[PDB]
């Protein structure tokens, strides 16, 4: 089984830089090496083909070089939507194999992230549980911390993190933290707050609400 | 246009067997191979085999040999692939992929050309003993620009699917990745940020849909207000 | 010879419930193997008979009713039961002695903005007799003040439209069903098995 190493396994780019990644093969496999761009939750697509042909419709800033067993794949100059994850394939021996992969991210200006708080539902208190959100949109760096003050103590253990993957517009961040009681036990206090620190935010912002109200 | 399309999300128990359909639109079925490729949730890509679409040839990577099945329907123009003895390391994503035509050369070689122009929707596959279970879908009513969105809690298993007034609301959507809680059930929040002064002129309903339990709800998100009594 | 099943289930169009369809199947030959060898029946129950038995049995004539329900009124096309199909569109006797067969037309029956040709009975004077149709559309008056051919209040058109769209759920989306009546009369046997 040919086995093709691909090298970075990570990397973090700005907007208009040139982006180079390699992929190494384990024996000579002529020129039949195929460059596809995964972006989360999509299925792969086909940007190079035959280690240097550029497939149709796919912009003239992407490239692609080598023979044997060295191969490149270049990108002129990035653009907000290039995020992806690329492979690089196979097929001059069966069985067809992929490399690891590449995982491909912007670098931005820092950005503040905007906070906002949903208290449970009417409609969900009805079957027994409270879930309180804490959300905060297109923020960058990734990094940021929230923190649920319940009547200012904090609550451990009992809220989840969601963080979307970059966007391919503004590339930015989004995060989802959930908080979930019991209503019996959601009940017992009367201020939830969503304290989130972030590079961006000259000091913690907290958003808080009053049960009941 | 080409087109594959697969079946739905599909769960089983470990030691069963999974047939996942793909139907070719656009083309002349028969002329082309067909290749199937599994990704598992956070990894990267593996072959597995190809099939001939007018003969029926098929070959198979030697760790799914014996236990992978490919199949052919030229009527319907539809491929099929079936996986038995699955268990926990087979949770992954099917993907059906059509490359182009192999050609004979000067010299009357046969060589492929075997790069994916086109690829299926994909098809999750999730190997667990757990039991299928729907979820329930909560507003998360709005309080400049506005956020408003819908909470998908307790359910499993992956995948749900969440548009906005039937995908006619698409900027500013944020579909958050699920988490598994303690519960072993999976929870879902699907936001979107709109002008304020839209709240009272626009109506915001979320469609979610889970088909592997059958379920599927226009959940109204209303603005919560304050001084509103009766 | 042989019976024109194909006619009945590959039919390109279908009729409403309040307007079904009978086909009358009379002195021919049917191979009842091709229908109960289709993975593509989502419902499949035969009363008073099985469909093991059917290719060797002999009848009078057969009757085969064609219509378009949604997704979970096909329950209701079933000995005693009621619900607005079963009462006020398609009745089916307690003695009926037969075979109803359903499948899901979502990928035909559906459009993008919503198929809206496809209509039933909501309002009703009374319930149907068993293999009993009605096509009025007289308006239906419900309370004590006469309608004299105009609805509105406590007036309605007795029919009502399915809202049939893809993007329905499983219970909402259009079903085909057809239902197969067996009438063993005191005659010669026209419709019989192959064996
Ligand atoms: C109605 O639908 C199709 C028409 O093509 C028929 O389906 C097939 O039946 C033949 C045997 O007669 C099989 O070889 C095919 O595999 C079947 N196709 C499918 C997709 O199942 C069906 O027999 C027709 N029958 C009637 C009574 O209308």
């Known amino acids: 089984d040919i086995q093709l190493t691909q090298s970075p396994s990570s990397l973090s780019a700005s907007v208009g830089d040139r982006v180079t990644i390699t992929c190494q093969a384990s024996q000579d496999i002529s020129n039949y090496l195929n460059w596809y761009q995964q972006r989360p939750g999509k299925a792969p697509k086909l940007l190079i083909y035959?280690?240097?042909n550029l497939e149709t419709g796919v912009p003239s800033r992407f490239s692609g070089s080598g023979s044997g067993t060295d191969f490149t794949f270049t990108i002129s100059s990035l653009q907000p939507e290039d995020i992806a994850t690329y492979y690089c394939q196979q097929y001059d021996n069966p069985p067809l194999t992929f490399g690891g992969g590449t995982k491909l991210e912007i670098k931005r200006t820092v950005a503040a992230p905007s906070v906002f708080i949903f208290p449970p539902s009417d409609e969900q208190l009805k079957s027994g549980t409270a879930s309180v959100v804490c959300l905060l949109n297109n923020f960058y760096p990734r990094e940021a911390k929230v923190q649920w003050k319940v009547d200012n103590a904090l609550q451990s253990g009992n809220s989840q993190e969601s963080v979307t993957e970059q966007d391919s517009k503004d590339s930015t961040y989004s995060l989802s933290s959930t908080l979930t009681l019991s209503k019996a036990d959601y009940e017992k206090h009367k201020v939830y707050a969503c304290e989130v620190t972030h590079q961006g935010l000259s000091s913690p912002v907290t958003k808080s609400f009053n049960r009941g109200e | 246009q080409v087109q594959l399309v697969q079946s739905g999300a599909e769960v089983k128990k470990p030691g069963a067997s999974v047939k996942v359909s793909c139907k070719a639109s656009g083309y002349t079925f028969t002329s082309y191979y067909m290749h199937w490729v599994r990704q598992a949730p956070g990894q990267g890509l593996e072959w597995m085999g190809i099939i001939n679409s007018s003969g029926g040839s098929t070959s198979y990577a030697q760790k799914f040999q014996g236990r992978v099945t490919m199949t052919r329907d030229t009527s319907t123009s539809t491929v099929y692939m079936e996986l038995s003895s699955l268990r926990s390391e087979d949770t992954a994503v099917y993907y059906c992929?059509?490359?182009?035509?192999?050609?004979?050369?000067?010299?009357?070689?046969?060589?492929?050309?075997?790069?994916?122009?086109?690829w299926g929707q994909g098809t999750l596959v999730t190997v667990s003993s757990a039991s299928t279970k729907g979820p329930s879908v909560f507003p998360l009513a709005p309080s400049g620009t506005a956020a408003l969105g819908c909470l998908v809690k307790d359910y499993f298993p992956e995948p749900v699917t969440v548009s906005w007034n039937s995908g006619a609301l698409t900027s500013g959507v944020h579909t958050f990745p699920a988490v598994l809680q303690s519960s072993g059930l999976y929870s879902l929040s699907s936001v979107v940020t709109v002008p304020s002064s839209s709240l009272g002129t626009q109506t915001y309903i979320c469609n979610v849909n889970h088909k592997p339990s059958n379920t599927k709800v226009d959940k109204r998100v209303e603005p919560k207000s304050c001084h509103h009594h009766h | 010879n042989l019976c024109p099943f194909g006619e009945v289930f590959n039919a390109t169009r279908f009729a409403s419930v309040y307007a079904w369809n009978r086909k009358r199947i009379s002195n021919c030959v049917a191979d009842y193997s091709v229908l109960y060898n289709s993975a593509s029946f989502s419902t499949f129950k035969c009363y008073g008979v099985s469909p093991t038995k059917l290719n060797d049995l002999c009848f009078t004539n057969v009757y085969a009713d064609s219509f378009v329900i949604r997704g979970d009124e096909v329950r209701q096309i079933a000995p005693g039961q009621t619900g607005k199909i079963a009462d006020y569109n398609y009745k089916l006797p307690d003695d009926f002695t037969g075979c109803v067969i359903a499948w899901n037309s979502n990928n035909l029956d559906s459009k993008v903005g919503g198929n809206y040709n496809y209509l039933y009975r909501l309002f009703r004077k009374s319930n149907l007799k068993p293999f009993e149709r009605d096509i009025s559309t007289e308006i239906y008056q419900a309370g004590s003040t006469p309608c004299n051919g105009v609805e509105g209040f406590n007036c309605y058109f007795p029919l009502q439209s399915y809202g049939f769209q893809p993007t329905n759920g499983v219970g909402y989306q259009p079903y085909r069903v057809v239902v197969l009546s067996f009438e063993l009369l005191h005659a010669p046997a026209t419709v019989c098995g192959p064996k």
């Open positions: 035959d280690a240097s």
């Open positions: 992929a059509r490359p182009p035509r192999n050609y004979y050369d000067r010299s009357g070689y046969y060589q492929r050309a075997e790069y994916f122009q086109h």
